Amino acid sequence: MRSAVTVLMEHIRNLYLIRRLSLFELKSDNSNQYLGILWEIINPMIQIAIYWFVFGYGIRGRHPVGHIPFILWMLAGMTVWFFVNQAVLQASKSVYTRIRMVAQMNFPISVIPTYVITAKFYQHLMLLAVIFIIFQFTPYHVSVYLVQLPYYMFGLLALLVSFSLITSTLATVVRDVQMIVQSLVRILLYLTPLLWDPSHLPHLVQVIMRLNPLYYIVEGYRSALLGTSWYLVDHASYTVYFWVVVILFFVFGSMVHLKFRAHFVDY
Amino acid sequence: MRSAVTVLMEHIRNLYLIRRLSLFELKSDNSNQYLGILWEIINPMIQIAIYWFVFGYGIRGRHPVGHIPFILWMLAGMTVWFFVNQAVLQASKSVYTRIRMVAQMNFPISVIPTYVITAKFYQHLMLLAVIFIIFQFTPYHVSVYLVQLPYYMFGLLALLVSFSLITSTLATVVRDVQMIVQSLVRILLYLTPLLWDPSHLPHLVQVIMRLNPLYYIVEGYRSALLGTSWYLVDHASYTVYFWVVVILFFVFGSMVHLKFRAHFVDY
Amino acid sequence: EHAVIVENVTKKYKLFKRTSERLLDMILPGGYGEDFYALRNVSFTADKGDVIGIVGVNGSGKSTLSNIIAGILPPTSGTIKIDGQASLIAISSGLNNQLTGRENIELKCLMLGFSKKQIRAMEPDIIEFADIGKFIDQPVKTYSSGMKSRLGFAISVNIDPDVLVIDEALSVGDQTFADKCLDKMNEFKERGKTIFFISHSIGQVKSFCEKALWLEYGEVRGYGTVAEIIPQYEKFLKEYRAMSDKEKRQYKERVMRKQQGEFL
Amino acid sequence: EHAVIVENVTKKYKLFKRTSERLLDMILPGGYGEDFYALRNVSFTADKGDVIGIVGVNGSGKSTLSNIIAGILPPTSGTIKIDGQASLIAISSGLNNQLTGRENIELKCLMLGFSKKQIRAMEPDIIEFADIGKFIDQPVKTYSSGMKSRLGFAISVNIDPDVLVIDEALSVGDQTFADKCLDKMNEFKERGKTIFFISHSIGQVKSFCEKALWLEYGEVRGYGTVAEIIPQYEKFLKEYRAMSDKEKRQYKERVMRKQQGEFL
């Protein structure tokens, strides 16, 4: 049973819709509210150095075994989590609000959590934009021979645009998984290693930690400074695990959508 | 110049007002929204064990030098921070919203951040209520000879009902300290020792860490299991520092209120 | 064909005397709440029509029956089949209060669904129609209350749907804008599509409609054109308003006869 | 004494063509935005009155001049001295949509300020006045749109202030509730306090008011009782509505003569 074709055709017919009113909430919240704007690089750069000051001062030595990894290891990974902590939560509560102001129109409601994620995608293109200015002070200048990450960038889109259907459609019917993912986004700072080296453990519990697909993309952005220009084949046994958990979430997310699509109006 | 008398008389004339519509937001948010209620002990008890699992597994031994302190040391302190992280932020944004629905009435606006704090005060009387059920499994049964903390409980009221005037009145005029205290509440997990033992340091930087008044109250609730039945005189040199920083915040909070009280309507 | 297939429509959102669901429940998903209907066994035909008024007392909600026909609430029992109908009227709704007048036109015209070349052809007429000239490049939170409604009618009129449903304004506007507004609504009457109009202004619904329902607590008490129903509707109100025989002695009984009208 | 000391009132919230403040600014707090007045040099007296209507075109906002007198906006230049005035009318505002009818009475009656024994004496009349009987123990998000306004008028009438200000409803209600509503507003006319009424319904303001302003873009064009002003106000509209000499050829000039009326 392929009902997910009906969801994916709606995003094809509305690709101008998903872009044009994407940046309106970016204009609504980041601007037209206060004084001098773009705290969203000022706020995490303060917020990064707090986590270094407590965790670099337990790992003063004992850094990852390359010559470079330091803070360099850390903030190359911490780009991803800023697009998780305030992009999974507000995607979930995007359908609690505003359905009164959406159901009185005629356009498919499946697109309604998908643009607010892409509204937070431009957080990267100011934050991940200013990491090159840091990374032009490395021993390499830019490593132009390998910064090839559009594919690993596209994973964060594909994972979150799929996962915010199980947590958006099923959010409105119960209003309790909002409390769940408010803690489940918390446990995904430590269940995945944004901070330490997971090589403190044998090959069972270490290998059974990357069942979380989010750790795969962190290996992508940390390989924005390595040189592994064929980073599929060294871990090809579970890079197909990544592209099967996204298609499992997307099919199951479509199935839970269409079995409730015309009912969440008394919620 | 004593303008703070005018603020404090308003809270005397409205003590039934500050209680009766306190629990309405408690009824509004915690109830009448979803299914089975009171996540606000279910959510932090999951949220406590995450911070133990990463920090008790660096302090597996090496615990505080009493025979008991363990997790026992930790969750006795972590009661306070749950009344800070989601009680300083929502107190600050309490006057961004709802002034359109308040200025069209006639009652003093100084009370308007003070009840939403007390609406979060009943979070204690379900969470701090269920810590005795844990603490009836200690080697002591309850230590009825010293659980005397109404005074140390009253500090958390007095600090936060005072501090949420500099961050509520001055919030609306700029709309940028909301972004500041969204990070300043973050730095007050590590600037104050909710987690480790600060006796890793000589008497200069260790003593210049308790300038934060919040660390004093954490010494109160951790002394809910000690037996120091005269815990003033061993630290009387700066328990008067606590009662002078609250009167400094309350006077300066009143001064910034009345110089702007009739102006925040175009914000 | 015949423009509605409305048959035996019932709708119930039920009463919860205490806090929300699983207030007392177990693993069995059944709850213990008091029953309350809002619509009961509604069946009518519109035979391509021109216009149908809906009147009564707003104890019967009256917007429930509207947005059922707009296809945005699911009926509990009964089937309705129309056409490519309208989202009813998006007056004063969907306007974000942080964006300018150029922006919120691109909101709502995209929310209703129009291509990128259609919103530029439809652009300068709307600014010409609203007459708010300098304020078009200023966000909506600076506008007065009569200018949001001035603007919100201007976008949500150029729809060309099949079946319109109007709320209780029909000319929200201002003086010397309602004259533009009523002439705009004469186009839909001229074009001959179906319009479901709801009001309490008896004088306007006499001046605008041809057929008319009359709804009472979910029960369709009578449905003809205009000529007998509204005076009998006025016969009910003049009966009700005068004394209606001592509103404690009989109208308390009348509601209890009508609370008995929740069932057999 | 004389019930207003309104003198030379001006108010300006100024134009920002781009995003919000410090859009281009430095350590000097001055900004670069275009000036815009909304009120200019208003001075009148109310001499204990009975009632003053306010009419015109809602390009002049008209609620600005109201809630200045309610004492909730600060004027830029000018002094106003009245009394213990009203918060104007809290219709459809302050009602939280999560609490029942017993609850939201305890909201708004406490928001307006009444002791704990006063809210129990004032309690059963309000339920008797609203007539929503079974729904009083059910939160407001279940109500229809005509029942919130049914309820919100019932609380925010028992105020006993000194100086009332009414928005543009005066009987929001329903048919066979407006008859209760207009008779309730006759009490304030009987008691003899001051009421500042704003409308666009010319027929109601003739039927209700004794004196009347007329405001045009912040400029008080004339102020008498009723008898000459409203027909001259109707003389302006019938001049304006008919052709007003080719609305592109002269009314575009007229607004530019009135944009010249933003200044000398």
Is the CB of D15 inside 8 Å of chain C's CB atoms? Answer: yes
Among chain A, residues having any CB pair with chain D shorter than 8 Å are 31-37
Residue D4 token pair: 């207003």
Q: How far apart are CA D183 and CA C3, in angstroms?
A: 44
Residue A77 token pair: 């990974």
* 8 Å CB contact between C258 and C244: no
Q: How far apart are CA D213 and CA D43, in angstroms?
A: 11
Residue B94 token pair: 């309490």
Whether residue A31 and residue D21 make contact (CB cut-off 8 A), yes or no, is: no
Q: How far is CA A54 from CA A50, A198, D58, in A?
A: 7, 18, 59
Residues pairing with D56 in the sheet: D215
D64 Cβ neighbours under 8 A, 6+ residues apart: D11, D38, D39, D73
Is the CB of A50 inside 8 Å of chain B's CB atoms? Answer: yes
Residues pairing with C211 in the sheet: C52
Is the CB of A58 inside 8 Å of chain B's CB atoms? Answer: yes
Specify the residue for token string 């404090």.
B8
Residue D29 token pair: 């707090």
Q: How far is CA B207 from CA A39, B191, B199, B204, B223, in A?
A: 33, 13, 10, 5, 19
| Residues 180-199 of chain C whose Cβ lies under 8 A from any Cβ of chain D | none
Q: Is the dihedral of CA D255, D261, D263, D264 positive or negative?
A: positive
Q: Could you tell me which chain C residue has the CA closest to the CA of B36?
A: C22
CA of A115 vs chain C CAs: smallest distance (Å): 13
* 8 Å CB contact between B165 and B151: no
Residue C58's closest CA among D132, D137, D98? D132
Beta carbon pairs, B and C, within 8 Å = 11
Whether residue B106 and residue D113 make contact (CB cut-off 8 A), yes or no, is: yes
Q: How many other CB atoms are there within 10 angstroms of residue B248's CB atom?
A: 11
Whether residue B265 and residue D110 make contact (CB cut-off 8 A), yes or no, is: no
* Neighboring chain C residues of A263 at a CB cutoff of 8 Å: 74
Closest partner residue to A104 (CB to CB) among C88, C106, C107 is: C88
Residue C200's closest CA among D169, D168, D179, D175? D175
* Neighboring chain C residues of A28 at a CB cutoff of 8 Å: 96, 98-99
* 8 Å CB contact between B154 and B106: no
B102 CA to centre of own chain: 26
The tally of CA atoms less than 13 A away on the side-chain side of residue D167 is: 19
Q: How far apart are CA C40 and CA C10, in angstroms?
A: 4
Residue A84 token pair: 């998780």
* 8 Å CB contact between C233 and C209: no
Q: What angle do CA B26, B32, B36 make, to 5 degrees?
A: 95
* Neighboring chain A residues of D21 at a CB cutoff of 8 Å: 35
Q: How far apart are CA C87 and CA A104, in angstroms?
A: 6
Whether residue B34 and residue A58 make contact (CB cut-off 8 A), yes or no, is: no
* 8 Å CB contact between A95 and A169: yes
Residue B12 token pair: 């005397």
* Neighboring chain A residues of B34 at a CB cutoff of 8 Å: 174-176, 179
SS3 state at A265: coil
Q: How many other CB atoms are there within 10 angstroms of residue C59's CB atom?
A: 19
Is the CB of C176 inside 8 Å of chain D's CB atoms? Answer: yes
For residue C135, the one-letter residue type is F
A94 Cβ neighbours under 8 A, 6+ residues apart: A112, A113, A116, A164, A168
Q: How far apart are CA D201 and CA D215, in angstroms?
A: 16
* 8 Å CB contact between D14 and D36: yes
Q: How far apart are CA B103 and CA C91, in angstroms?
A: 27
Residues pairing with D42 in the sheet: D9
Q: How many other CB atoms are there within 10 angstroms of residue A258's CB atom?
A: 14
A91 CA to centre of own chain: 11
Q: How far is CA A254 from CA A111, A164, D82, D216, in A?
A: 12, 11, 63, 57
Whether residue C144 and residue D62 make contact (CB cut-off 8 A), yes or no, is: yes
* 8 Å CB contact between D192 and D161: no
CA of A260 vs chain C CAs: smallest distance (Å): 11
Whether residue D62 and residue C240 make contact (CB cut-off 8 A), yes or no, is: no
Q: Taking each helix axis from N to C terminus, what angle separates A150-166 and A214-222, rounded to the nearest 10 degrees?
A: 160
Closest partner residue to A35 (CB to CB) among B34, B58, B176 is: B176
> Nearest 5°: phi and psi at A246?
-80, -35
Residue D99 token pair: 């609490």
Query: B38: left (phi > 0), else alpha (psi -120 to 50), else beta?
Result: left
DSSP string, A221-238: HHTTTT--TTTTGGGHHH
Which burial class, exposed, middle or buried, applies to C104 when counting CB atoms under 10 A from its CB (0-12, 13-18, 19+)?
A: buried
Residue B174's closest CA among B183, B163, B166? B166
* 8 Å CB contact between C49 and C194: yes
Q: Is the dihedral of CA A46, A50, A51, A57 positive or negative?
A: positive
Q: How many Å is the Cα radius of gyration of chain A?
A: 20
Closest partner residue to C17 (CB to CB) among D57, D137, D147 is: D137
Q: How far apart are CA D205 and CA D55, in angstroms?
A: 9
3-state helix vs strand vs coil in chain B, percent to 5 = 60, 0, 40
Query: D218: left (phi > 0), else alpha (psi -120 to 50), else beta?
Result: left
Whether residue A58 and residue B58 make contact (CB cut-off 8 A), yes or no, is: yes
* 8 Å CB contact between C203 and D141: no
DSSP classification of residue B77: T
Residue B161's closest CA among B220, B116, B218, B125? B116
Q: How far apart are CA A91 and CA A114, in angstroms?
A: 8
Whether residue B50 and residue A175 make contact (CB cut-off 8 A), yes or no, is: no
SS3 state at B262: coil
Sheet of C77-79: strands edge to edge? Answer: C39-42, C7-11, C77-79
Whether residue D176 and residue C146 make contact (CB cut-off 8 A), yes or no, is: no
CA of A49 vs chain C CAs: smallest distance (Å): 33
Method used for this model? cryo-EM
Q: How far apart are CA D85 and CA A65, in angstroms?
A: 75
Per-residue three-class SS string for C10-43: EECCCECCCCCCCCCCCCCCCCCCECCCCEEEEC
* 8 Å CB contact between C103 and A25: no
Which of B26, B29, B37, B97 to probe by mutation at the C interface, max C CB count within 10 Å? Answer: B37
Residue C197's closest CA among C40, C30, C62, C1? C62
* 8 Å CB contact between A214 and A80: yes
CA of B25 vs chain C CAs: smallest distance (Å): 14
C67 Cβ neighbours under 8 A, 6+ residues apart: C73, C88, C165
Q: How far apart are CA A211 and CA B34, in angstroms?
A: 31
Pairing of strands C211-216, C51-54: parallel
DSSP string, A72-133: HHHHTTHHHHHHHHTTSHHHHTTTTSSSHHHHTS-S-GGGTTHHHHHHTGGGHHHHTGGGHH
> Nearest 5°: phi and psi at C76?
-70, -40
Q: How far is CA D96 from CA C27, D93, D101, in A?
A: 32, 8, 10
Q: How far apart are CA A129 and CA B237, in angstroms?
A: 50
Q: Catalogue the E-assigned strands of C81-240.
A: 163-166, 194-198, 211-216, 219-224
Q: Could you tell me which chain B residue has the CA closest to the CA of A29?
A: B175
* 8 Å CB contact between C57 and C216: yes
Q: What angle do CA C92, C95, C101 make, to 5 degrees?
A: 110
Please give the helix or strand (H or E) that residue D77 lies within, else none: strand D77-79
Contacts 24+ apart (CB under 8 A), A99-102: A99/A172, A99/A264, A99/A265, A100/C93, A101/C93, A101/C94, A102/C94, A102/C111
DSSP classification of residue D80: -
Q: How far apart are CA C108 and CA C94, in angstroms?
A: 7
Residue C15's closest CA among C35, C42, C29? C35
* Neighboring chain D residues of B265 at a CB cutoff of 8 Å: 72-74
Q: How far apart are CA B12 and CA C255, in angstroms?
A: 46
Q: How many other CB atoms are there within 10 angstroms of residue B82's CB atom?
A: 20
CA of C93 vs chain B CAs: smallest distance (Å): 19
The resolution, in Å, is 3.9
Whether residue C237 and residue D176 make contact (CB cut-off 8 A), yes or no, is: yes
Which of D16, D17, D18, D19 to probe by mutation at the A interface, max A CB count within 10 Å? Answer: D19
Residue A18's closest CA among A150, A111, A142? A111
* Neighboring chain B residues of A39 at a CB cutoff of 8 Å: 176, 179
Per-residue three-class SS string for A149-218: CHHHHHHHHHHHHHHHHHCCHHHHHHCCHHHHHHHHHHHCCCCCCCCCCCCCCCCCCCCCCCCCCHHHHH
Q: How far apart are CA C127 and CA B37, in angstroms?
A: 50
Q: How far apart are CA C195 and CA C53, in angstroms?
A: 8
Residues pairing with C219 in the sheet: C216
Residue C126's closest CA among C99, C140, C108? C108
Query: Domains of chain A: which residue ranges?
Result: 1-267
Q: How many other CB atoms are there within 10 angstroms of residue D61's CB atom?
A: 21
Q: Is the dihedral of CA A6, A9, A15, A16 positive or negative?
A: negative
Whether residue A24 and residue C96 make contact (CB cut-off 8 A), yes or no, is: yes
Among chain D, residues having any CB pair with chain A shorter than 8 Å are 19-22
Q: How far is CA B100 from CA B72, B110, C75, in A?
A: 46, 15, 37
Please give the helix or strand (H or E) that residue A1 lies within, else none: none
For residue A91, the one-letter residue type is A
DSSP classification of residue B30: I
Whether residue A36 and residue D22 make contact (CB cut-off 8 A), yes or no, is: yes
> Nearest 5°: phi and psi at C42?
-100, 130
CA of A5 vs chain B CAs: smallest distance (Å): 32
Is the CB of D239 inside 8 Å of chain C's CB atoms? Answer: no
Residue A183 token pair: 């803690």
Q: What are chain B's partners, defined as 3 or more CB pairs within 8 angstroms?
A: A, C, D
Q: How far apart are CA B170 and CA B114, in angstroms?
A: 15
Closest partner residue to C74 (CB to CB) among A28, A101, A262 is: A262
Q: How far is CA D193 from CA D51, D64, D153, in A?
A: 8, 22, 19
Residue B252 token pair: 């300066």
Q: How far apart are CA C241 and CA D20, in angstroms?
A: 54
Q: How far apart are CA B170 and CA A48, in angstroms?
A: 27
